[PDB]
Amino acid sequence: MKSYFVTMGFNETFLLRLLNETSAQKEDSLVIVVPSPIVSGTRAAIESLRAQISRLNYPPPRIYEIEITDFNLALSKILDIILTLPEPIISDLTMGMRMINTLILLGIIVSRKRFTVYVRDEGGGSRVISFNDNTIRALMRDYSREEMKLLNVLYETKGTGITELAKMLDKSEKTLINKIAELKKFGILTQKVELNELGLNVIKLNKSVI
Amino acid sequence: MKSYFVTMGFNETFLLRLLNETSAQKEDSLVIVVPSPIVSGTRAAIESLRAQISRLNYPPPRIYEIEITDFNLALSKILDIILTLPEPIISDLTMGMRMINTLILLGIIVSRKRFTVYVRDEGGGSRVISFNDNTIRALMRDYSREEMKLLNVLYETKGTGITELAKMLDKSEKTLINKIAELKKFGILTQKGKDRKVELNELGLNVIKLNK
Secondary structure (H helix, E strand, C coil), rough: CEEEEEEECCCCHHHHHHHCCCCCCCCEEEEEEECCCCCHCCCCCCHHHHHHHHCCCCEEEEEEECCCCHHHHHHHHHHHCCCCCCCCCCEECCCHHHHHHHHHHHHHHHCCCCCEEECCCCCCCCCCCEEEEHHHHHHCCCCHHHHHHHHHHHHHHCCCCCHHHHHHHHCHHEEEEEHHHHHHHCCCEEEEEECCCHHHHHHHHHHHHH | CCCCEEEECCHHHHHHHHHHHHHCCCCCCCEEECCCCHHHHHHHHHHHHHHHHHHHCCEEEEEEEEECCCCCHHHHHHHHHHHHCCCCEEECCCCCHHHHHHHHHHHHHHHHCEEEEEEEEECCCEEEEEHHHHHHHHHHCEEEEEEEEHHHHHHHCCCHHHHHHHHHHCCHHHHHHHHHHHHHHCCCCEEEECCCEEECHHHHHHHHHHHC
């Protein structure tokens, strides 16, 4: 089982879209946190959501209402929820109070739990961004000197084969193949070995470090 | 100088409030990123903002439009902006497209730059939350066994002086004083009053929770 952790405003449709897109199971954990008191528009969205969840054999939601007056006091409550959720935690930040969505995102990140987050066009267009714990790990990681050298060669060549890459780095093909295998799992390159767009953002950050 | 980096929707009020509350100076760098194409509501808000900034001797904005369709492509553009900004970077996520605010926050965090972020009640109430690079660093830090013992002691005792702590942890005052000074700089504990007792703060309580 996995989990869904979101907030809610007046429109339940983004959550139903999330649940559909990510193949929600009846056995998955769905938690929704809302500000207290729960205003009429939010109550109406929740009753509509519940009805549609029943029809669609989706996970029935556990709904918690919370005070949001201070970063750390609110984060504590958000963490109480997160540290109980089975992984990965799936979320969509398009709906509900900005302050609550911020706490949800930050809580998920500092929890070190596996996660996928979506953020859509709030006006109903088709554009969407998503990222996961691998994305953030890749960006937040402190790369070694030899790792940055390797990545920089891929950057400047727009990709190159193992044989050529091994000669430029003064490393054996065996050594390079193992290291490429590792970084491929880290999500920043593919294979001719090439950086992907996540790898290109790593290059940008590591220029900053240099 | 410091920087401000925000997006914008149809209401400039929150940015003006941010600038006022954080003592914006003419010499500070203000950058605003907006979605492309620029819609009339946002164009109007920007013109109003520009007029008000001039009157108040606030930093004149550099405004950039961005197309937002993919996480990494868009983050690349956001990083190009961030990695040039003087620190600290100040932002407010209450205004503008949610996807852009998400990219701004993540960009600021992964940039390793000093920052403070505010998020307010979009309904115009007084509720606000804020956090900074220290907040995130404290929560993501790896604490040692001996560190967690110290923190748990402070939790269980509800605060104690150096002298008493040294006895409880069986540590020299010197070593304890140094550690406390360190963790105080991380913002997770305080030392207050005439008794100078060392106490966890609310950030420290979250550190404990994460390392439970």
